[PDB]
Ligand binder design. Structure first.
Ligand code: CA
Ligand code: CA
Length: 198
């Protein structure tokens, strides 16, 4: 099973057995080596009903549309992260690679499902160095039970693996993706994934 290039699919974070946040993305690649999807500026965000074990998804500060520059997400099937191509909202300049540690993506009839795992890594565009992010925030959340011990050990190992890869110059992703730009017609997507009535 695969999705076609340009298909509009759901990108979901699933928490407590239900959608936490979901938003439509366009498919750029759906291959055994790469799932690449695009979240465009102005796209509608769907949030699940409270309460969640983790509280409301933090993108709820933007209300119900993605206000910033579009995000290309690059995923190597089976890995416990994806890599986001982040650009400057004002200039469109490529700024950084944002490694979002999260559950390996699951294919669903509607798209892909994952779940944020708090630890992030950031590689600036110049590729001089990289930084770990939110490790202690992660650990506090693991201590209060947001992650089980088995989950938290998997998360720590995944983040360590990616950091070791980057530091060895063996980052899996093709950095030429930093020059990709969406087709001109790839604008805001307005699809809601809400299931009213519950
Ligand atoms: Ca994250
Ligand atoms: Ca984080």
């Amino acid at each position: 099973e695969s999705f076609a290039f340009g298909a509009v699919v759901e990108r979901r974070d699933e928490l407590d057995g239900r959608p936490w946040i979901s938003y439509p993305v366009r498919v750029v690649a759906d291959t055994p080596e790469l799932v690449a999807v695009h979240l465009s500026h102005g796209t509608r965000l769907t949030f699940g009903d409270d309460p969640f074990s983790w509280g409301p998804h933090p993108w709820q500060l933007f209300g119900d549309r993605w206000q910033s520059a579009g995000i290309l997400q690059l995923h190597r099937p089976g890995r416990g992260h994806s890599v986001w191509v982040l650009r400057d909202a004002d200039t469109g300049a490529f700024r950084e690679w944002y490694v979002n540690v999260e559950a390996p993506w699951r294919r669903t009839p509607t798209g892909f499902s994952t779940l944020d795992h708090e630890i992030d890594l950031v590689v600036p565009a110049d590729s001089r160095t990289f930084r770990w992010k939110d490790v202690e925030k992660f650990e506090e959340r693991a201590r209060i039970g947001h992650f089980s011990p088995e989950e938290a050990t998997a998360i720590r190992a995944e983040a360590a693996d990616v950091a070791r890869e980057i530091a060895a110059g063996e980052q899996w992703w093709d950095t030429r993706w930093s020059r990709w730009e969406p087709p001109a017609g790839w604008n805001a997507l307005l699809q809601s994934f809400e299931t009213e009535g519950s």
